Amino acid sequence: KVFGRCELAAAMKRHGLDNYRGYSLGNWVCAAKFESNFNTQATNRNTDGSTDYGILQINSRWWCNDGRTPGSRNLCNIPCSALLSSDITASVNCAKKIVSDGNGMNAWVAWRNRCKGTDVQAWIRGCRL
Ligand SMILES: CC(=O)N[C@@H]1[C@@H](O)[C@H](O[C@@H]2O[C@H](CO)[C@@H](O[C@@H]3O[C@H](CO)[C@@H](O)[C@H](O)[C@H]3NC(C)=O)[C@H](O)[C@H]2NC(C)=O)[C@@H](CO)O[C@H]1O
Ligand SMILES: [Cl-]
Ligand code: NA
């Protein structure tokens, strides 16, 4: 599923991401835009053999199990395929765990390079909400 900008914003707010750990809704919408272009089915292979999954490109080395990343961990205790559903519930719960681990949203490289410090409130402009 390719979400619309305001559609994803309302979904993220309903699942409790608005201001979670002090990060406003626009930050999460911006991060999703540059990580996956709002496509829930996005997948990307890393050089170390791990894979990134879903709307927020969560990594298999630490957070989920895909059965093909030898030596990995599974801190969200969930199959990586569950992060590709049209329903973003699993991705949001895991992202809540990730952002609390110590380095905040710097866990997402695209957020650090393209969203951090910018006028992120623009990403929720025009949405009823
Ligand atoms: C969205 C996503 O999956 N991003 C991936 C990053 O999570 C990952 O970076 C590494 O993440 C781990 C787990 O959060 C970091 O470990 C933590 O380190 C801090 C101190 O910096 C400490 O508070 C924690 O104890 C420790 N957690 C543990 C041990 O469970 C680690 O610092 C990150 N490594 C880096 C930044 O080099 C990167 C790299 O694998 O991939 C992203 O896709
Ligand atoms: Cl980047
Ligand atoms: Na794993």
Provide the terminal-to-terminal Cα distance of the chain, rounded to the nearest Å. 22
Q: Which residues in 74-111 are b (16+ Cβ under 10 Å) and which e?
A: bebebebebbbeeebebbbebbeebbeeeebbebbebb
Distance of alpha carbon 96 from alpha carbon 63, whole angstroms: 12
Distance of alpha carbon 85 from alpha carbon 62, whole angstroms: 20
User: With left for phi above 0 and alpha for psi between -120 and 50, is residue 92 left, alpha or beta?
Assistant: alpha
Nearest ligand 1 atom to the CA of 48 is: 40
- 43: which strand partners? 53
Distance of alpha carbon 25 from alpha carbon 11, whole angstroms: 11
Provide the 10 A C-beta neighbour count for residue 60: 23
39 DSSP 8-state letter:
B
What was the resolution (in A) of this experimentally determined structure?
2.2
Task: Report the greatest alpha carbon distance in the chain.
Answer: 45
Task: Tell the residue number behind the tokens 């993220």, with chain if given.
Answer: 12
* Amino acid, res. 52: D
Active-site annotation holder among 48, 52, 66, 119: 52
Cβ atoms of 91 and 54 closer than 8 Å: yes
Distance of alpha carbon 99 from alpha carbon 47, whole angstroms: 23
Cβ atoms of 105 and 17 closer than 8 Å: no
- The residue among 29, 31, 63, 30 whose CA lies nearest residue 46 is 63
Active-site annotation holder among 7, 35, 66, 87: 35
Domains and CATH numbers, the chain: 1-129 (1.10.530.10)
**Residue 67: strand, helix, or coil:** coil
